[PDB]
Amino acid sequence: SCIQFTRHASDVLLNLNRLRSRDILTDVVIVVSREQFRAHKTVLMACSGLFYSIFTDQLKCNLSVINLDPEINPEGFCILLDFMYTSRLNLREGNIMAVMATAMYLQMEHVVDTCRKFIKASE
Amino acid sequence: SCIQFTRHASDVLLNLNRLRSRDILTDVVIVVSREQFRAHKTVLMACSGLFYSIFTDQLKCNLSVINLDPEINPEGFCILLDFMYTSRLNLREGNIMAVMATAMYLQMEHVVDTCRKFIKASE
Amino acid sequence: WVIP
Amino acid sequence: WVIP
Ligand SMILES: CSc1ncc(Cl)c(Nc2ccc3c(c2)CC(=O)N3)n1
Ligand SMILES: CSc1ncc(Cl)c(Nc2ccc3c(c2)CC(=O)N3)n1
Numbered sequence: 001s002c003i004q005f006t007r008h009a010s011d012v013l014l015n016l017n018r019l020r021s022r023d024i025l026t027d028v029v030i031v032v033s034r035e036q037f038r039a040h041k042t043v044l045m046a047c048s049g050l051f052y053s054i055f056t057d058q059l060k061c062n063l064s065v066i067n068l069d070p071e072i073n074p075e076g077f078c079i080l081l082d083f084m085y086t087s088r089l090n091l092r093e094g095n096i097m098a099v100m101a102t103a104m105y106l107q108m109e110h111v112v113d114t115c116r117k118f119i120k121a122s123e
Numbered sequence: 124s125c126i127q128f129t130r131h132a133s134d135v136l137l138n139l140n141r142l143r144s145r146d147i148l149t150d151v152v153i154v155v156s157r158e159q160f161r162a163h164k165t166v167l168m169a170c171s172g173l174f175y176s177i178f179t180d181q182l183k184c185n186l187s188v189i190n191l192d193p194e195i196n197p198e199g200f201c202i203l204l205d206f207m208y209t210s211r212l213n214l215r216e217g218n219i220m221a222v223m224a225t226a227m228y229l230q231m232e233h234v235v236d237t238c239r240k241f242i243k244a245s246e
Numbered sequence: 247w248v249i250p
Numbered sequence: 251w252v253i254p
């Protein structure tokens with residue numbers, strides 16, 4: 001018999017992004033080919049199967065720095081990190097291949113699906 | 124020119140609640156009249172003006188335990204903590220006064236608004 | 247607010 | 251996915 005506030009989840013995510021932009025309570029640095037991205041472990045886990053696996057590991061959960069595979073493109077990661085905190089994906093002809101590869105590695109199934117669909121439309 | 128994934132914010136919040144239910148990466152205990160509630164500081168800040176003020180304070184941001192005012196009802200707090208992580212508010216005739224008072228103290232403006240409206244309808 |  |  002609960003009532004539901006429609007905009008609550010969107011408002012929470014908007015506030016989490018405001019905390020990220022001001023570097024408030026960020027507890028991890030993600031290193032991608034020498035580029036560094038600060039974020040909240042909980043948000044990374046909530047969006048990515050890879051980060052979920054990493055931060056539920058009894059040893060890795062305590063790491064303040066995570067280094068991604070050197071094949072990962074920093075721009076592709078930046079676009080996906082922005083998507084995690086906003087629901088908005090900056091998908092362009094010039095970045096779609098790097099974004100899909102990064103989403104496959106991060107295990108972000110819905111992003112992989114839209115990239116596959118957009119690539120299939122261009123062929 | 125971004126595309127947007129409609130269910131992303133809801134899916135993030137659902138995963139954050141799964142982390143809370145399994146006590147994964149919770150970093151604070153909220154004490155309410157001897158009852159203890161584990162939560163994520165970032166989610167508390169994202170939902171409440173009071174927690175936002177507390178955890179942006181240079182000294183309080185480092186506290187692992189926060190004690191609420193003794194007038195705060197533990198059931199009212201539990202209902203609001205559930206709302207924070209789910210967007211669902213268990214508002215009932217028997218709890219509406221305790222829920223409104225707790226939401227006013229926590230500075231959760233949208234909850235205060237619906238409680239005022241539901242109380243006004245009953246008079 | 248809605249009835250979910 | 252939608253055009254926001
Ligand atoms: C599976 S239970 C669960 N509980 C809590 C969290 Cl934080 C979590 N995250 C997560 C796991 C897998 C995947 C994603 C998030 C996005 C995606 O495409 N795959 N999962
Ligand atoms: C105001 S900028 C901002 N930036 C980040 C966060 Cl985490 C935050 N939270 C917050 C502040 C005030 C209120 C709420 C959340 C809910 C409510 O009713 N009032 N605010």
Ligand SMILES: [Cl-]
Pocket residue numbers: 062063064065
């Ligand atoms: Cl480390």
Ligand SMILES: [Cl-]
Pocket residue numbers: 047108109110111112
């Ligand atoms: Cl996704």
Ligand SMILES: [Cl-]
Pocket residue numbers: 185186187188
């Ligand atoms: Cl403490």
Ligand SMILES: [Cl-]
Pocket residue numbers: 170231232233234235
């Ligand atoms: Cl609210």
